[PDB]
Structure formats: C-alpha cells, structure tokens
Amino acid sequence: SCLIPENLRNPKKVHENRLPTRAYYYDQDIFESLNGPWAFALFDAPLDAPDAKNLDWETAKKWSTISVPSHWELQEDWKYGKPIYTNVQYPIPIDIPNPPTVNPTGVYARTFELDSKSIESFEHRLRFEGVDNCYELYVNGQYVGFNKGSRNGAEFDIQKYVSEGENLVVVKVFKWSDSTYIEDQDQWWLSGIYRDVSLLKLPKKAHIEDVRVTTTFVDSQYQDAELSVKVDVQGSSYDHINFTLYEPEDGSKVYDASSLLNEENGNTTFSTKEFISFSTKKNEETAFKINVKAPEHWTAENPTLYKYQLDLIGSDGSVIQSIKHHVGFRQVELKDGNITVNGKDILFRGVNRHDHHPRFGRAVPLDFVVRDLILMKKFNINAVRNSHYPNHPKVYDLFDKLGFWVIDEADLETHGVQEPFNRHTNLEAEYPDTKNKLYDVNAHYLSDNPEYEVAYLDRASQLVLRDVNHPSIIIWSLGNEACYGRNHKAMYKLIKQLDPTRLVHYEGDLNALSADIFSFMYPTFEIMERWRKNHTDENGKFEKPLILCEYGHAMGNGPGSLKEYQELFYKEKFYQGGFIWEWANHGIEFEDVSTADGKLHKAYAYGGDFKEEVHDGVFIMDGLCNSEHNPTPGLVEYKKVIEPVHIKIAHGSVTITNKHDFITTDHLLFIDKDTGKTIDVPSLKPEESVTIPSDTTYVVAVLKDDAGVLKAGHEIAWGQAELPLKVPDFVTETAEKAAKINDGKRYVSVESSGLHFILDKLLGKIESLKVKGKEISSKFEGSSITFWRPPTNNDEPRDFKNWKKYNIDLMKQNIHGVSVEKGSNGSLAVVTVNSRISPVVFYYGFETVQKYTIFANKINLNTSMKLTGEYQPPDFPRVGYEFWLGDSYESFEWLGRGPGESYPDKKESQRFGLYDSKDVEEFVYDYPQENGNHTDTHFLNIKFEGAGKLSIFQKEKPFNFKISDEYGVDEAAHACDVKRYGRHYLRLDHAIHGVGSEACGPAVLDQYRLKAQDFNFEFDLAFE
C-alpha cells in the first residue's frame, strides 16, 4: 500500500529514536514549557501534508494557531471536526494493520530561542507527555524521530539539531495507525497534542538519567526495612552521589490544590529535618542499600511519606543535579492467596477513573484531577484504577500524597475485534465465567498475533518504567478487554523482570496464567461464588484472590444493590473488593436545540449528538459523578455502603466495628445525634468492635481535625436505629355536620362546611377536592391509578421492553359501577367506585374497588386491586395515584428518607429524618429519566399558601412519593429538553420497582422487583 505511509501500517514501528523510558521527575530548572499557541494546519491525509524537511517558519507563520495542549475536535466552532463516541465497535474498517487511507493529519509548528551558553551547558531534549494517535518530529527541517502510544510519554535527543537563535519544531500528527487497533477504549475518539510539551535542559558533562527506589521489609513482622536506591548516571564528569532521607510527615498532613500543585523551586530548601545520610565514593557503584529502623508505613488510609534529596556531585564538590522526591515504606505481596500490603490483606473501595473534562476532553488540567481525588476521598473511596491507560505523569504524586491504592494500566484495548463476531452470531450475553471462549476465537488478530509483540511489550515497558517509584501503585495491569494471547504472556514476563515488587492484573486472562490476581467485571453473586468455590481447596486455601475491576455500572439512576455486593466482600477473605465503573459521565458541553423550548441551551453530549456514522449513544453517561464531575445519588449511595466503620443500633446498644484495613478509630469523633453530646469510644483496631449501652437513635462518626483534604466535622460513617411507623396524631372530625349529596347522571357532589368533593362517575376522576382552602384533583389520562415511569438507563435493555410490550403505559380505567351512600360513623358520605384497570390490546388487568370515605377534614381512600386475566407482565414500574396540586401549593415536607431521592435497592444512604423541600437541590440527570422518588415515607405534608398543610399517610406501611413539575421525560434527550406544566403534581405510590444495574450487569434483584400481584392499600388525606 503506497497510498498509506509505511510507518502508519507497521505494528513493529513503535517509535524511531525515542529515548529509553525512565522514572518521571518534574524539575523546574530542567523543564521548560513549550505549551501555548502553535502554527497549525489540518490535511485530509498524509499525502496532502507538506514535507517537513522543507517547511520554513516563514511559511508556517502564516497558518492559524491552535493552543497546546488541546484536542483538535474540541475547538471554538468545531473548526477541526467533532468528537466521535464508540464503545466496542471500531470507527474504522478492520484491515489489520492498515489504517484508513483518508487519515486526518495535523501539522504543528512553533519556534524557541537558544543561547550561545545554552548549547554549551546543556543536553537538549523534547518531552511529549501525550499525542494521539502518533507523530513524526522535526527540528530545523531535520527528521528527529517517530512515536506511537497515545497515553504514554516520549523523549527525543535534540542536541545534534539545534542552532543558536531561532529553532523550528514541527510535529506531524496522525489520527489513525496500526496502533489504533490496540487503542479501542470505550471513550471519545479525540486527536492531537493533548498533553504538555517540554524542552529539557540537562547538565551536559554528567546528569541523572534514572532512579530506582524500592522498600522491602526484612522481616515477617514488618518492622525494619531495606531502602534500596539505584541511580543511573550518564557521563564521566562526576565524583559521587549524596542521599538524604528526611524525618517522615504523617499521612494526616493537610493539603489543598495549591500545595499539592506547587512546583517550586531552585533556591527552595526541600527539607532540613535529616534522618539518614549516605555518600557514595569516587569510582564506586552509584547505588546503595540502607537498613532503616522501624519506619512509618505508607498506606492508602495513612499516606505517610519520607522526603528525600538525591545529589549528583562533581570533583569540586558542587551539586551538578538534585532530585527531590519521596519514599513510601510499603510492600505488596501475593501472600496465602491474598493481595497483601505490609502483610495485610486489603480491601479495595475503588473506582475506574478515565481522563475526562466536559470542555477539554482528555487534556485535563491538573487542578481538575485534584478536584476529582478530593471528591473521592470525601466519599470514602480508597483506590483507583487508571482505566484504561496511564494518566499525566504528575498525577501519581497526587495518589502518593492523598493515599489511593492504584492500578496503573497499560494503554491497550482490543475490544472491537469482537463486534463483527457478536453480530454474526447474534450473541445476547457475555458472562465473566464463560466469555473468554468467545474472545479466544479472535485473539489471533492482535493479542495472539506475533507481529504485535513489540507493540505490546512497548506498552508494558512504557507503563512500568515511567511510574516505578510511586508507592501508591501496587498493581500493573496489562490493559483491558484485549482477548488473551502470547503477547500478554510476554508482557507478564517483561514486567516481572522490570519490576519484581508489584503484582500483575489482566481481566482478559480468566485463569490468570500470566497474572497474579483473578478479576471479574459485572459478575452475578452466583458467578462470584462458583469461582470462589472452584478455587478454594478442601483445606480452605486459595492460590489467588478475586477483585472486581469493574462492577456496579453507575449509568443513570443507579446502581442498585451495592449493598449486596459489599456484604459479599466482607464475608469472604477470597474477595478483596472492587472498582465501580465509572467515576464520571464523559459528557462534552455543547449547544443543544430544545425539544421543550425551541431554543438553544447548554447541554452535555453523548453518542449521536455529534452525528457520528456509528456511535454507542448514552453509554457515555455511566459515572457516579455527572459530566461536570459533581456527585450523583450513585456516589452518595456508594459512600454509605463502603463506609469504613459500622454503626449498628439495636436493643439499647450501639455496636461500632472498625472496618479499616490499617488505621484506628482515634481520629473519629462519635456524636449521639439525639442529645448532641459525644460518645466515649475506645480506640478500635481493624476488625475490633465494641458494644455501648445507649438510648440513642442516631449516631454519627465524624473527623476530629482537618486531615489530608478533609475538614474537621466531615462525616465518615453513621448508623440509625430502625424507625417504627407511627400514625400521626391527626384528629378526624367525626362530629355530625349536615352534608349535601348530589348524585347526578355523570357527576357526584358532596358538599359540607369547608368541603367540596366532585367525582366524574364516567371516568373515576376526581374533578375537584377542596378542603379548607386546599385543593387537589386527579391528574388523569386514561386512569386514576397509573403504573408507568420514564425508563432509567437500567430499565432500557429488558424491563422497559417488557413494560412497553404489555402496554403498561396505556393502562385504562373502565368504570363499571359507582355507589353513593350517606355517611355512617362520623362519616359525611361514602362513594365506592368499581372498575377494571386494564390496558388496550390486553386481557390482564385489575378488578378495582376504590372506597372514598369522606369526613369534614379528612378523606380515607381504600384501594383494592385484584389481578385478573391471562398473559400478564412479570412486574410493573410503579403503582399509585397522580394528583394535580392547587394554585396555592408552595412547598412540601416529609418524614422518611432524605434529603435526596431513594429507591428499593438504592436507599440506605438516605437516613430517616424530617425533611423540607426548601433545603434540597433536587438532582438533575444528564440523561432525563425516573428521578425524585422518596421511598419508606412515613408521612408527607403538602403546604398551601394561606391554608396550612395537607397531611398524607399510608396505613401500616411506609409509601413512595414524588412531587414535580415535569413531563416529556421519556423522550427528552437532555435536561433542557424536559417539559414543564403550569402546576405541580403529586405522584403518590403504594410501591415502586427497584433500580438495579442491568444496563451493564445484573437485573434488579428479586426482593426489589415490583412483581405482578394483587394490590391493597389505604391512604388518608388529612386537611389541617
């Protein structure tokens, strides 16, 4: 293929002239930023781009500019195209290893100044932190080299090419290559120089090239440790190295964005609290091993660090170069079948975090990454998986300092090889225990393809060698969803040679033939349990443990049943936790035309909005946080189920159990919320518990002092005693009032002092109910009892298909008889309505009796619903009344769960209490769907201006409710597409279907499903 350049279709051309990967250290004196405006032009394909060996700055000066770093699909007015979203499918034809012939090619150009002294004093390099997909590099019209690996770095020696005065850098960037085949992550396709570019000036005669730091405990009791520091010095003109380790700074250290990101400085004295000092001797190995007496451990719960300074020293005893970094005393092992850190079998409370920003894409400001991690810490997360590639190199000090268990992952995904296979065989489902046989079929294309070995090894080598020295990283991962083949085995051998100190993960390798860990994604409990049992021998020993590298798919309303996963995690030593997918929605900000308004509004794009030929729609929106990286109810729920302290209140006792891996409860203040006075809780070690006699209902565990990025008073855990359903002390007026009953041909009236009740007998509709200045009426379309909800993302693949199939949205009430009698026991009147509630097309439905017992200040509504007929649905979304609220309506207040929404399998984070609608910002989903329900509601007060409250309570069971404004939710593509009525309604529900995680994972669990059955429930409408 001579119409496609050789290097874009050669899997072995991983780079040309790239320097060997070394440990990353930012140094202000060495690093000089080349970020900013660059000359830029885009071409249809390589053959339209100029020859860079002949490109003048005088010519490039005339082009438009683009700012580095940024993606070229994310510019003002979509100047250079729009983002493309695909999940599994490749957006190109599969013709390995050829990219498409029409291959967007972007040429970047800028200049920089070089001194006379500069070229003499320094070795000059260019370092590119990330360029997608690949590029060739030119300096002063001379070819320097080539590079592949979008999320990896690259350094090139530039010394031969530089001149005094102006220097011209030209980068030719290509969108597609043979590399595209191994970069098929479920994310946006975005191109360009999206990470920092730097000019490096290293001391010329000698400099530090690489450093290796390891900490190995000498002993099984993890006290004394050996600190090993090996240095690679390049050049002859040096004497020796010095090394100073400083006194530790406890992991409880207070940070903020400013101090975490501070990059200074040359004259800045790193530290002076010396602990250990070592010097090398002239002509001796520039490495050493030191015994360290009982050092403070580095742990994710307590990220204690020892700062160090490494000095390269010349003959005259002057400092040639310094490295200022840190040591975290930590050892990871596979021990008795568990992932072990300092001897302890840890629990992952994790997420997958992609690089994403709603405006900049994968070009994420560090400021924003810090924001992410502070939020994670604020919500009890202790681990992150770098799905599915290494991040910006500066991010790893953030993990080190804040404390996260980190899975650093190779930039390698091959998923798309399956798509044609899936479609050709009409595959419906993949299961963690069996799906590997399906991937085995196509592994020969890439992961079992010898032509790709060099590329695969490069992804491994680049991954490990850049980030080796970060204590936060405990696991290397070979990539994601790339099938299984010989190349993976090769990667495993190499990584163990390069870095024996860590463990290797790869989920595509079911049996872990070349991994140290087992890993499932989105497994069913039964599937987890099968695996556990088949890998635990008769003695109870297992060789390797199980983690869930992805689980509890956080797409939209959900995920349900995080609780049940957690119970499983705590019960078996074999399970060591999981990482939920995903941290945040990948929404891109854009201008949307409103379906509600006809006008232009800000929205967040998912597949289809940028009009891709092929895309995967709303699967972009699968985070615990929204596109703006703010918490959803998903994150709120996750924080609760993973809380590292259990507080159980029953039988006049509070039981507190420490569920941390390492730290004590000493940092926590326990408050009795009923009294406000604190509770003396003994210092609890991991897994230790205590029972304290108490009359309390509600206990909170809170931070005593600012520590890390958390503030004093920040809630870590809490518990409540279960709250019995109490009938409010409402006094029903049973005194005898004269009442006019008018039973007309169609309408029935009941009028009394302060009361007006009108029912349409033909429809079963309440035309108007006005009691003491407060009015409601039925929100009626076909039926007075309704069943539909705007489908969640989880509802879509199955439950919605069923509910639509059975016409649940078209349920009709057909009145058979209406009975009107005078009041009995204090009653004004009794109106009884007999009907069948059934959808068009169908036999199935409910023989329904609605008995309205009318009192002067209260209306008792008894509902009896008998499920009858053949060919029934399995379940319903919902069941209850819809009422229009009067013009007077202003706000509401409830006793039950809050402050936020709650659903059967997503409710426990929402503690019991008295809540006011005025105190709550109701959550707006990036993709409109079922929202705003409140489950386990004891009572609900609806406030009407100038007329007090209407109290609503269900007899003998808590109920569900939603008060809103909104409709057209099913078909609104974005928040701004949601329509709004001129009045509010109450959705008053006996029961509601759970939420689950079926968009990717298990269906709503049995105990949370709203199964088809008879319904019988009684409500009181009490008017103040």
For residues 509 and 436, give the distance between their C-alpha atoms in angstroms, rounded to a whole number: 8
Rounded to 5 degrees, what angle do the CA atoms 862, 868, 872 make? 115
Lateral strand order in the sheet of 31-33: 31-33, 197-203, 122-128, 154-157
**What are the b/e assignments for 487-512, b being 16+ CB within 10 Å?**
bbbbbbebbbebbebbbbbbbbbbeb
Of 443, 462, 465, 440, which is closest to residue 452 (Cα–Cα)? 443
The DSSP output letter for 733 is -
Token pair 């009361």 in the structure block, residue:
755
861-880 residues in contact with its own copies (CB under 8 A) are 869-872
Q: According to CB under 8 A, which one of 204, 486, 530, 836 is a site residue for its own copies?
A: 836
Beta bridge mates, 659: none
Nearest approach in angstroms of CB 798 to its own copies is 13
Binding mask 596-625 for its own copies (x = CB under 8 A): -----------------xx-----------
The secondary structure element, H or E, covering residue 4 is none
Look at residue 279 and give the partner it binds from its own copies, Mn ion, none, a contact being a CB closer than 5 to 8 Å depending on partner kind: none
In DSSP terms, which residues pair with 577 in a beta bridge? 348
**Rounded to the nearest whole angstrom, what is the least distance from the CB of residue 10 to its own copies in the complex?**
15
**Which among 711, 707, 713 has a CA at the least distance from the CA of 664?**
707
Question: What would the two tokens of residue 398 be?
Answer: 């953030």
| Contact pick of 11, 471, 839, 958 for its own copies (by CB under 8 A) | 839
Report in angstroms the alpha-carbon separations of 703 from 1, 371, 698.
Answer: 65, 20, 17
**Tokens 């119409």 label which residue?**
3
Q: Is 46 helix (H, G, I), strand (E, B) or coil?
A: helix
Which option in its own copies, Mn ion, none does residue 429 bind, with CB closer than 5 to 8 A by kind? none
Specify the residue, 100 or 932, whose C-beta has the smaller distance to its own copies: 100
Angle 946-948-951 from CA coordinates, rounded to 5° = 150
Closest distance of CB 81 from its own copies, Å: 16
Q: Is 708 a residue that touches its own copies (CB under 8 A)?
A: no
The site for Mn ion (CB under 5 A) is made up of 592, 973-974, 977
Q: Does 763 bind its own copies (CB under 8 A)?
A: yes
Cβ proximity to Mn ion: between 413 and 592 the closer is 592
Cα distances (angstroms) measured from residue 965 to each of 823, 962, 979: 36, 10, 8
Partner whose binding site includes residue 101, from Mn ion, its own copies, none (CB under 5 to 8 Å by kind): its own copies
Minimum distance of its own copies from residue 447's CB (angstroms): 16
Q: Which does 807 bind (CB under 5 to 8 A by kind): Mn ion, its own copies, none?
A: its own copies
Asked whether 865 and 846 are in contact (CB, 8 A), the reply is yes
At residue 621, what is the residue type?
M
Residue 6 near its own copies by CB under 8 A = no
Phi, psi (deg, nearest 5) at residue 204 = -75, -50
Among 34, 351, 815, 947, binds its own copies (CB under 8 A): 815
Tell me: does residue 45 bind its own copies (CB under 8 A). yes
Q: Which of 155, 183, 481, 582 is catalytic?
A: 481
DSSP 3-state of 860:
strand
Q: Tell me how far the alpha carbon of residue 195 is from its chain's centroid.
A: 22
Look up tokens 């002294």; give the residue.
Answer: 117
3 state DSSP class of 669: strand
149, 192, 560, 845: residue in contact with its own copies (rule CB under 8 A): 845
Options 31, 368, 662, 844; binder of its own copies; rule CB under 8 A: 844
Q: Helical H runs in 507-584? A: 525-535, 562-571
Tell me: does residue 758 bind its own copies (CB under 8 A): no
Contact partner, 974, from Mn ion, its own copies, none, Cβ < 5-8 Å per class: Mn ion
Pairing of strands 653-658, 645-650: antiparallel
Q: Which is nearer to its own copies, 51 or 921 (CB)?
A: 51
- Which of 243, 169, 232 is closest to 202 using CA atoms? 232
Closer to Mn ion at the Cβ: 778 or 792? Answer: 792
Among residues 476, 322, 328, 465, the alpha carbon closest in space to that of 399 is found at 328
Which of its own copies, Mn ion, none does residue 295 bind to, with CB < 5 to 8 Å depending on kind?
none
Q: Check if 687 is active-site.
A: no
Give residues 509-548 in contact with its own copies (rule: CB under 8 A): none
Q: Which stretch binds its own copies (CB under 8 A): 26-34, 86-94, 484-492, 930-938?
A: 86-94
* Residue placing its CB nearer to its own copies in the complex, 305 or 483: 483
Identity of the residue, 89 or 387, whose beta carbon is nearer to its own copies in the bound complex:
89
439 binds its own copies (CB under 8 A): no
Contacts of 244 (CB under 8 A, 6+ apart): 274, 276, 277, 278, 308, 309, 311
Rg (CA), the chain: 33
| Binding residues with its own copies: total (CB under 8 A) | 56
The smaller minimum CB distance to Mn ion, of residues 240 and 974, is found at 974
Note whether 843 binds its own copies by CB under 8 A.
Answer: yes
Can residue 680 be called a binding residue for its own copies (CB under 8 A)? no
Q: 973 is in the binding site of which of its own copies, Mn ion, none (Cβ under 5 to 8 A by kind)?
A: Mn ion
What, of Mn ion, its own copies, none, does residue 341 touch, CB below 5 to 8 Å by kind? none
Tell me whether residue 45 or residue 976 sits nearer to its own copies (CB atom): 45
Closest CA to 371 of 601, 583, 688: 583
DSSP state of 573: T
CA of residue 763 relative to chain centroid, distance: 47
Helices (H), 468-590: 486-498, 525-535, 562-571
Q: Which partner, Mn ion, its own copies, none, binds residue 845 by CB below 5 to 8 Å per kind? A: its own copies
Listed ranges 44-52, 73-81, 652-660, 1003-1011: which one lies at the site for its own copies (CB under 8 A):
44-52
Asked if 428 is part of the footprint of its own copies (rule: CB under 8 A), the reply reads: no
In angstroms, give the least distance from the CB of 417 to its own copies: 8
Backbone discontinuities in the chain, residue before each (C to N > 2.5 A): none
Residue 455 in contact with residue 12, Cβ under 8 Å?
Answer: yes
Least distance (Å) from Mn ion to the CB of residue 971? 10
Region from 69-77, 358-366, 417-425, 733-741 binding its own copies, contact rule CB under 8 A: 417-425
- Nearer CB in complex with its own copies: 365/869: 869
CB of residue 974 to Mn ion, shortest distance in Å: 4
Q: Which of 550, 882, 901, 966 is catalytic?
A: 550
Q: Does 101 bind its own copies (CB under 8 A)?
A: yes
Q: Which is nearer to its own copies, 47 or 920 (CB)?
A: 47
d(Cα 935, Cα 907) in Å, to the nearest integer?
A: 7
Q: Does the annotation mark 628 as catalytic? A: no
Give the shortest CB-168-to-its own copies separation in angstroms.
Answer: 23
Q: Which stretch binds its own copies (CB under 8 A): 69-77, 100-108, 221-229, 730-738?
A: 100-108
Q: Please state, in angstroms and rounded to a whole number, the distance separating the CA atoms of residues 292 and 280.
A: 18
Can residue 47 be called a binding residue for its own copies (CB under 8 A)? Answer: yes
Backbone torsions φ then ψ of 889, nearest 5 degrees:
-50, 130
762 binds, among its own copies, Mn ion, none (CB under 5 to 8 A by kind): its own copies
Nearest to 222 by CA among 346, 345, 343: 343
Q: Residue 592 CB, nearest distance to Mn ion (Å)?
A: 4
Member of 694, 697, 814, 964 binding its own copies (CB under 8 A): 814
| Tokens 């008053």 sit on residue | 988
The item of Mn ion, its own copies, none sharing an interface with residue 592, based on CB under 5 to 8 Å by kind, is: Mn ion
Residues recorded for the chain: 1024
Binding site for its own copies (CB under 8 A): 1-4, 44-45, 47-48, 89-95, 98, 100-102, 416, 419-421, 423-424, 613-614, 745-746, 761-763, 805-807, 810, 812, 814-818, 835-836, 838-845, 869-872
**Catalytic residue numbers, as ranges:** 481, 550
